Design an enzyme around this catalytic site. Structure first.
Site, PDB file in Angstrom:
ATOM      1  CB  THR A  24      -1.086   0.088   1.021  1.00 43.10           C
ATOM      2  OG1 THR A  24      -0.339  -0.032   2.387  1.00 43.10           O
ATOM      3  CG2 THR A  24      -2.010  -1.160   0.873  1.00 43.10           C
ATOM      4  N   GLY A  25       1.725   1.380   1.047  1.00 39.10           N
ATOM      5  CA  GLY A  25       2.748   2.423   0.995  1.00 39.10           C
ATOM      6  C   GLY A  25       4.056   1.995   1.871  1.00 39.10           C
ATOM      7  CD  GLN A  26       4.591  -2.812   3.998  1.00 35.84           C
ATOM      8  OE1 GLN A  26       5.631  -3.221   3.764  1.00 35.84           O
ATOM      9  NE2 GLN A  26       3.639  -3.607   4.789  1.00 35.84           N
ATOM     10  N   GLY A  27       5.246   3.087   5.683  1.00 38.47           N
ATOM     11  CA  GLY A  27       6.167   3.904   6.250  1.00 38.47           C
ATOM     12  C   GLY A  27       6.458   3.536   7.695  1.00 38.47           C
ATOM     13  CG  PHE A  29       1.389   5.771  12.762  1.00 35.90           C
ATOM     14  CD1 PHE A  29       1.838   6.778  13.988  1.00 35.90           C
ATOM     15  CD2 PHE A  29       1.031   6.432  11.641  1.00 35.90           C
ATOM     16  CE1 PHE A  29       1.702   8.148  13.653  1.00 35.90           C
ATOM     17  CE2 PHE A  29       0.839   7.999  11.665  1.00 35.90           C
ATOM     18  CZ  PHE A  29       1.159   8.772  12.483  1.00 35.90           C
ATOM     19  CB  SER A  30       0.941  -0.477  12.556  1.00 31.86           C
ATOM     20  OG  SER A  30       1.391  -0.484  13.900  1.00 31.86           O
ATOM     21  CG  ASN A  31       4.593  -3.404   8.603  1.00 29.39           C
ATOM     22  OD1 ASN A  31       4.694  -3.204   9.797  1.00 29.39           O
ATOM     23  ND2 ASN A  31       4.664  -4.403   7.976  1.00 29.39           N
ATOM     24  CE  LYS A  48      -2.603   0.549  11.463  1.00 26.81           C
ATOM     25  NZ  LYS A  48      -3.329   1.771  11.913  1.00 26.81           N
ATOM     26  CG  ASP A 146      -2.833  11.698  13.834  1.00 23.28           C
ATOM     27  OD1 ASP A 146      -2.378  12.733  13.708  1.00 23.28           O
ATOM     28  OD2 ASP A 146      -2.331  10.442  13.492  1.00 23.28           O
TER      29      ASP A 146
HETATM   30  N1  1EH Z   1      -2.319   3.334   7.531  1.00 28.90           N
HETATM   31  C1  1EH Z   1      -3.403   2.843   8.109  1.00 28.90           C
HETATM   32  O1  1EH Z   1      -3.492   2.627   9.084  1.00 28.90           O
HETATM   33  C2  1EH Z   1      -4.504   1.964   6.872  1.00 28.90           C
HETATM   34  C3  1EH Z   1      -4.325   2.262   5.757  1.00 28.90           C
HETATM   35  C4  1EH Z   1      -5.218   1.721   4.842  1.00 28.90           C
HETATM   36  C5  1EH Z   1      -5.458   1.576   3.592  1.00 28.90           C
HETATM   37  C6  1EH Z   1      -4.659   2.339   2.597  1.00 28.90           C
HETATM   38  C7  1EH Z   1      -4.130   3.360   2.777  1.00 28.90           C
HETATM   39  C8  1EH Z   1      -3.074   3.718   1.876  1.00 28.90           C
HETATM   40  C9  1EH Z   1      -3.186   2.736   0.830  1.00 28.90           C
HETATM   41  C10 1EH Z   1      -2.548   2.805  -0.466  1.00 28.90           C
HETATM   42  O2  1EH Z   1      -2.450   1.998  -1.238  1.00 28.90           O
HETATM   43  N2  1EH Z   1      -2.021   4.070  -0.612  1.00 28.90           N
HETATM   44  C11 1EH Z   1      -0.836   4.330  -1.907  1.00 28.90           C
HETATM   45  C12 1EH Z   1      -1.641   4.779  -3.119  1.00 28.90           C
HETATM   46  C13 1EH Z   1      -1.500   6.013  -3.942  1.00 28.90           C
HETATM   47  C14 1EH Z   1      -2.185   6.323  -4.854  1.00 28.90           C
HETATM   48  N3  1EH Z   1      -2.891   5.538  -5.433  1.00 28.90           N
HETATM   49  C15 1EH Z   1      -3.265   4.446  -5.140  1.00 28.90           C
HETATM   50 CL1  1EH Z   1      -3.961   3.372  -5.852  1.00 28.90          CL
HETATM   51  C16 1EH Z   1      -2.436   4.082  -3.818  1.00 28.90           C
HETATM   52  S1  1EH Z   1      -4.307   1.693   1.220  1.00 28.90           S
HETATM   53  C17 1EH Z   1      -6.647   0.828   3.129  1.00 28.90           C
HETATM   54  C18 1EH Z   1      -7.423   0.063   3.956  1.00 28.90           C
HETATM   55  C19 1EH Z   1      -7.311   0.418   5.352  1.00 28.90           C
HETATM   56  C20 1EH Z   1      -6.062   0.961   5.686  1.00 28.90           C
HETATM   57  S2  1EH Z   1      -5.610   1.214   7.377  1.00 28.90           S
END
Ligand code: 1EH
EC number: 2.7.11.1
Length: 331
Positions: A24-27, A29-31, A48, A146
């Site tokens: 998804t992103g992976q930084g 608070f929790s990947n 998560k 937050d």
């Molecule tokens: N960081 C968190 O606590 C959570 C993030 C997410 C998420 C996502 C957050 C960010 C997501 C992600 O794929 N971000 C990168 C991105 C940027 C631009 N376009 C797309 Cl399609 C994806 S998915 C989805 C469902 C539940 C949770 S809980």
């Protein structure tokens, strides 16, 4: 490993069902990872992975408790909060199964352009959903602490938003005297001064977010807690004398004569004594390009809504019901 984060592998099967295909992103608070549930016809889910260390382990279990309470109180899923499917453990890490959501609002703004922002119609729809999320948080007696574009997710069509990350969340009775509560740019003035805070801090954060949603830029890009009060006072004037005295950390920003102490760099600190702060920040000019009357009237209504949200005193701040019944939403 040493830090606490989990070394995620693509193609790995979690809980004998979740096949991880992408990140998804992976930084963070929790990947968070993207997976397909083979036990449920390969349906997409978001997993998560909570950090192994005791600092984040307690945070993860707290987040699990808050998500459960908010989901049970909203069975029809009409109060725009992230839905937790279930939870499991993998290599000592707590794993939370969530909705397959597309991206966060910070990622949406990046795709829209440099200081472009979203369309006024999208901002209108997003406001109502954000206020509906505030209604459920108040009903459950939970403070998010937050609310920002990073913690607000959207579906693939970008029509439905869901509030995420309940790691820094807390109960009303479990209030702690700290000036670092809430991400600095979205931090309410009552947190900084040390006044008794409630649901108003979440309302303030929504206001900061809604301005950023339309303008594409941070409302109060304050470098410190002192600079945050200055920028907030640049719009609504000097903080009321009754509010300053109620604050615990009042001596760090104000003196005995109730005057603001502005700190400036250069490189040594220079304290500027201010008897009165005149409202210089033009919120209307910052919002507006100048387009047709249908959009022009909507921008003016958002300005009025922002003025009612961005009130320094949380007692004189707009309520959730009034925000939902405001002219900007009701069109
Ligand atoms: N960081 C968190 O606590 C959570 C993030 C997410 C998420 C996502 C957050 C960010 C997501 C992600 O794929 N971000 C990168 C991105 C940027 C631009 N376009 C797309 Cl399609 C994806 S998915 C989805 C469902 C539940 C949770 S809980």
């Amino acid at each position: 490993d040493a830090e606490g984060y989990y070394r995620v592998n693509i193609g790995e099967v979690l809980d004998k069902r979740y096949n991880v295909y992408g990140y998804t992103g992976q930084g963070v608070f929790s990947n968070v990872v993207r997976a397909r549930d083979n036990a449920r016809a390969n349906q997409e889910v978001a997993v998560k992975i909570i950090r192994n260390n005791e600092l984040m382990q307690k945070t993860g279990l707290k987040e699990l408790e808050f998500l459960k309470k908010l989901n049970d109180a909203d069975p029809d899923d009409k109060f725009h909060c992230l839905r937790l499917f279930r939870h499991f453990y993998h290599k000592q890490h707590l794993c939370l199964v969530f909705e397959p959501l597309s991206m966060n609002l910070r990622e949406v703004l990046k795709k829209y352009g440099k200081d472009v922002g979203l369309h006024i119609k999208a901002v209108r729809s997003y406001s109502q959903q954000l206020f509906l999320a505030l209604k459920l948080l108040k009903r459950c007696n939970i403070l998010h602490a937050d609310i920002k574009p990073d913690n607000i997710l959207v579906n693939e069509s970008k029509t439905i938003l869901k509030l995420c990350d309940f790691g820094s969340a807390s109960h009303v009775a479990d209030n702690d005297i700290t000036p670092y509560l809430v991400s600095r740019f979205y931090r309410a003035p009552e947190i900084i001064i040390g006044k008794s805070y409630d649901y108003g801090i979440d309302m303030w954060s929504v206001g900061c977010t809604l301005y950023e949603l339309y303008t594409g830029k941070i409302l109060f890009p304050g470098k410190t807690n002192n600079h945050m009060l200055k920028l907030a006072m640049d719009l609504k004037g000097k903080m009321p004398n009754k509010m300053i005295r109620k604050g615990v950390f009042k001596d760090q920003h104000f003196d005995q004569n109730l005057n603001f102490m502005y700190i400036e760099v250069d490189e040594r600190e220079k304290v500027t004594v201010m008897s009165t702060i005149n409202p210089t920040k033009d919120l209307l000019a910052d919002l507006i390009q100048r387009l047709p009357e249908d959009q022009r009237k909507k921008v003016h209504q958002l300005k009025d809504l922002l003025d009612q949200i961005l009130m320094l005193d949380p007692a004189k701040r707009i309520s959730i019901n009034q925000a939902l019944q405001h002219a900007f939403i009701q069109e």
